[PDB]
Design a protein around this ligand. Structure first.
Ligand SMILES: Cc1cc2nc3c(=O)[nH]c(=O)nc-3n(C[C@H](O)[C@H](O)[C@H](O)COP(=O)(O)O)c2cc1C
Ligand SMILES: Cc1cc2nc3c(=O)[nH]c(=O)nc-3n(C[C@H](O)[C@H](O)[C@H](O)COP(=O)(O)O)c2cc1C
Lengths: 202, 205
């Protein structure tokens, strides 16, 4: 079932691409795709070097894709420097890719608090203990610090570096594999105000 | 299933090989033992002149001592971006073992003799569709494209390599190897080019 998945929207696309993104994620859940929200997120520094890492996005709203990270991380510094990001979903089970490219906009502090509060107690402990992407000086010390934080046995406050971003799409591409190699490619791009769609050669 | 997706062994975290490609190859070989599905599916990111980034999956052909070899159309979006700005980053992620590998570098075009060999190693149906398609250009008539690919296959003549079909080597200046840990202190090993040598660092998760 990794080829020729149903894609009626290829010929009749929704006005907004986030609508199709949500529909695809729902079908992925029905197909029991493993970790469908694991997004390969690329960012860049100003000189143009690009970096990448997996991010499991938190949610989707009508304006974009929400994720959280440490602002002092490597991706954090790059998001602050240039703003540009490109996230890629790829589901091996269904032969589908979704590319979401645009600007990552920092969320408000109330939104950051909500993102932190939503997570588990063990997550809070290591995320409070670790300064993501800084050099690790002493593995044993960092483990012990996370364990001491966990043992406080109460809800830990949000570290100031723990922040959310909304990836606001400027362009999105949907790709669905075809057994005859003529893959279905649907591209959305911002043309002044609104969305222009096109089908692409494979 | 032959592994959990946490706590895979990673002895190189505390004693890294001098060259990161050596570790990349070891990881890919272990990924095959672990029966990882499509381990070579690389999320390849490129950028245009103004810094806008785009990404897509590429399945790389091979790995030599200098980098990761892949093929694509030079006139595709990625091909134009590589020509414009050079920098690229590729990400591998294996759900079955909890591992990711980040390869950041420049894509160096291969020689024409290498491109010819790569085209020869492909099937005639691949030749026909690759010849009939201008990757990433607007598709105006789908049935026409399908029909032209079928015509090329039916001729039974050797199909020439279109000049747009080319290979690149992604040559790293930076790599990171990441392996999940159940206690959340994930193993993170960064390689950065340092002249003719490499420098390594362990990172906080
Ligand atoms: C499945 C998966 C999900 C992840 N989700 C996040 C996440 O939501 N936020 C985050 O900061 N890192 C997440 N990570 C860790 C990142 O891949 C990366 O290691 C970390 O964010 C540091 O990246 P950087 O050094 O490029 O800034 C996740 C990793 C995996 C494998
Ligand atoms: C599993 C997988 C492997 C792929 N391998 C390649 C490849 O080796 N070369 C290629 O040009 N496109 C490959 N593609 C298609 C790309 O994802 C993408 O559609 C394409 O190359 C056009 O990208 P662009 O418009 O960003 O240039 C692959 C897609 C998938 C899902």
């Amino acid at each position: 079932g990794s080829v020729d998945v149903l894609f009626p929207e290829y010929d009749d696309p929704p006005s907004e691409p986030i609508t199709l993104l949500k529909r695809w994620l729902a079908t992925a859940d029905v197909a029991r795709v493993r970790e469908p929200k694991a997004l390969a997120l690329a960012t860049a520094t100003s000189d143009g070097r690009i970096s990448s890492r997996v991010i499991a996005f938190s949610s989707i709203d009508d304006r974009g894709v929400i994720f959280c990270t440490h602002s002092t991380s490597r991706k954090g510094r790059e998001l602050t420097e240039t703003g540009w990001a490109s996230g890629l979903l790829y589901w091996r089970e269904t032969g589908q890719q979704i590319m979401i490219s645009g600007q990552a906009v920092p969320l408000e502090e109330s939104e950051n608090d909500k993102l932190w509060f939503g997570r588990s107690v063990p997550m809070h402990a290591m995320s409070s203990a670790s300064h993501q992407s800084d050099e690790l000086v002493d593995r044993e010390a960092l483990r012990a610090h996370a364990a001491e934080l966990l043992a406080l046995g109460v809800a830990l406050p949000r570290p100031p570096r723990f922040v959310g971003y909304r990836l606001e799409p400027h362009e999105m591409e949907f790709w669905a594999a075809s057994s005859d190699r003529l893959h279905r490619r649907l591209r959305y791009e911002r043309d002044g105000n609104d969305w222009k769609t096109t089908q692409l050669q494979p």
